From a paper:
Viral replication requires a 3C-like cysteine protease (3CLpro) which processes the 200 kDa viral polyprotein into six functional proteins. The active site is characterised by a catalytic dyad (Cys139-His30) or triad (Cys139-His30-Glu54) and shows a strong preference for a –D/E-F/Y-X-L-Q-G-P- (X can be H, Q, or E) sequence corresponding to the subsites S5-S4-S3-S2-S1-S1′-S2′. The key role of norovirus 3CLpro in the processing of the polyprotein and the absence of homologues in the human host make it an excellent target for antiviral drug discovery.
Fragment J12 is the worst in terms of resolution, diffracting to approximately 2.1 Å, although the electron density is still of good quality. Screening with the DSPL library and part of the Maybridge Ro3 library identified 19 ligands in total which bind in five different sites, as illustrated in Fig. 2.
Residue numbers in the entry:
A (entry chain B): 3 to 173
B (entry chain A): 1 to 173
The structure:
Amino acid sequence: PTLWSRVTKFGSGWGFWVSPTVFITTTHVIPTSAKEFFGEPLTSIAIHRAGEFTLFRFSKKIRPDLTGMILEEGCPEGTVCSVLIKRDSGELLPLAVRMGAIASMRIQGRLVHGQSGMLLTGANAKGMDLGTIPGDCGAPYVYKRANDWVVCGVHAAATKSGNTVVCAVQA
Amino acid sequence: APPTLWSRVTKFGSGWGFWVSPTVFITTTHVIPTSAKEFFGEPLTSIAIHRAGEFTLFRFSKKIRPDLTGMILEEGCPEGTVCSVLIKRDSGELLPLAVRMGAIASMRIQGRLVHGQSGMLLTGANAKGMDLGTIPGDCGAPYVYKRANDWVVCGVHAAATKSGNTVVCAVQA
Ligand SMILES: Cc1cc(C)nc(Nc2ccccc2)n1
């Protein structure tokens, strides 16, 4: 049983299974030409979109092996989350991120709305596995609270250089 | 982390070890099978074993891994270095866990006395457990970092605290 099995390749990025019927992803990674996802006709899928956050609700159990997890609209300011990055090499890269305010941020000359964060893996990556790349979009932000895992949004954007990431949130 | 570093990470006893070169293999002392008299088809007589607490180095008299180039092994790393711990998990999943390294330390963990280079995981806030932190089966995994153009190995995974936020790298002496 693992959080990592819920992280799924999707479109030009990734998404996350909250429950057997609920999948979350970043809006800009979703295909714009499709009649089905995960073998289910698009006719039978409810799509709920809020800026860079999208939630799919399926009419049957796609992932019956999973329990349902707590999904919230962001997290309290100062919470340290993990972004659960999968790479096509087969690497799993959990990175600590300190979450800040909900904001409109200028990220490579474009406006992105969501919960700001700062990577805690330090000055740079180099060739080291310490930062995000554009193909990581849709990876989930998670943290542990009491005995429960909480999912609070999806990876939407990052500055090419610095420290700053945007986590798109529900509602 | 480069494929050539993952290729050197080898399942061994109750954990792992790592090929520095075609003749040199390093691991954590407590993962070695205690009754073993043969390694990679070679008897004990043809191997030079150098043990310093939880760090063990095996030097073979023939080339076991001729596919490999020899790389740099150092005695830990500067304080503040960020390393990756190259951990293999159930099913060809590769977990290069980020760790900020600190001072050489003597600690008591689950009653055992442990000595090596301390570090703190950079994977999340509460790293107890297998999704963001280490498990006992990870002992012997290598600590590596990139220094300008090349990669360095600076120890092997020896222990983690009950909270899982602190780890100890056993180092060559
Ligand atoms: C940069 C910074 C400032 C402050 C106040 N807290 C933290 N938290 C932290 C850092 C690494 C791992 C886990 C938590 N980080």
